[PDB]
Structure 1
């Protein structure tokens, strides 16, 4: 009615900071054969590296994957996901991300440690066997990678470093593109995520 006085000042928004930076240079050499090495070896060399780099960053964000939200996966005695063979492998069972991922990284991690598809001794045919086996491995590395994007994109940011996922994607594409070994529809689900993200250079 008369002379009243009222005021309130407040503005919160303190964002935390303190992330580390990895100085990975001379990555170009890692994209193309070293000086002059065999191709069959190159493929096997980059596989362990590629899968190791992708499998490594996923281990930090994989812990984020929670809830049944995983399109339901097959795992367990009664029903489980088997590799190599493809005779009826699609049934609903209790299986989370860290669970299905295990079988994904397991298979891959196995071959990298299974002296048979790698160069060591004479026996297995690289230009025939290593190709079929390697084709199943490469497809697995990317497939699992996308998991971080779709299944838990936010999880990437929640871990401070997010550009890492996108950065590694370049080497995953540039590498296959440089040698021209791309194929399958796996490439389809790529132009979309790139367009949505955009292009930030400056």
Structure 2
């Protein structure tokens, strides 16, 4: 079996909006959590994701990904998966380390555009999962971490599903696996 999961509390309850909680704060704290998880999980296989194995960042032959630059004005960039994903990790961490967007203090409110910023983060976090599953699940099995990977993805996709933060068309590279876990 390779669809195994780890023991844990009920993940559907774990992603529910607690009573009296601000939705932005709930999105913020879980986004910081999920980024660290996928950043840790990608670090396990980083020596297997190379320029030779992944010349084009993708989730399989049909889902080629391009990088939309946030500072330079240029058509989205077609690049390797190691270049794309470490582009992405430093970019996300810069967002979370910005008190303007993810305020940790009490007296600082969330920006008017916080939702759009978080859903762009959550969209790109999904693409690291999809690249790992499609192109590196053999390395996942050789390190015996299927259950931890699946459990992290299960937690992540339940939170996205709970609040509808990624479009279904973007979840397409893993539609079969998504409906397998949520049943």
TM-score between both structures, scaled by the size of structure 2: 0.72
Report the counterpart of residue 130 of structure 2 in structure 1. 146
Task: Tell whether the 8 Å contact from 1:19 to 1:161 is kept in structure 2 after alignment.
Answer: no
CA shift for structure 1 position 150: 1.8
CA shift for structure 1 position 168: 2.1
Task: Tell whether the 8 Å contact from 1:41 to 1:119 is kept in structure 2 after alignment.
Answer: no
Task: Tell whether the 8 Å contact from 2:17 to 2:23 is kept in structure 1 after alignment.
Answer: yes
CA shift for structure 1 position 147: 1.3
CA shift for structure 1 position 60: 0.8
CA shift for structure 1 position 88: 8.9
CA shift for structure 1 position 126: 3.7
Q: Structure 1 residues 143 and 40, CA, compared in 2 at 3 Å: closer, same or farther?
A: same
Report the counterpart of residue 7 of structure 1 in structure 2. none
Task: Tell whether the 8 Å contact from 1:73 to 1:96 is kept in structure 2 after alignment.
Answer: yes
Q: Which runs of 5 or more residues in structure 1 are unaligned?
A: 1-16
Query: What is the alpha-carbon distance in structure 1 between the residues aligned to residue 35 and residue 3 of structure 2?
Result: 24
Q: Which runs of 5 or more residues in structure 2 are unaligned?
A: none
> How many pairs are equivalent?
183
TM-score between both structures, scaled by the size of structure 1: 0.66
CA shift for structure 1 position 42: 0.5
CA shift for structure 1 position 154: 0.5
CA shift for structure 1 position 105: 0.6
Query: What is the alpha-carbon distance in structure 2 between the residues aligned to residue 125 and residue 197 of structure 1?
Result: 36
Query: What is the alpha-carbon distance in structure 2 between the residues aligned to residue 128 and residue 106 of structure 1?
Result: 23
Task: Tell whether the 8 Å contact from 2:160 to 2:166 is kept in structure 1 after alignment.
Answer: yes
- Whether 2:9 is the aligned partner of 1:25: answer yes
- Structure number with greater Rg is 1
Query: What is the alpha-carbon distance in structure 2 between the residues aligned to residue 110 and residue 118 of structure 1?
Result: 10
Report the counterpart of residue 55 of structure 2 in structure 1. 71
CA shift for structure 1 position 139: 0.6
Structure with greater contact order relative to length (CA < 8 Å, sep ≥ 6): 2
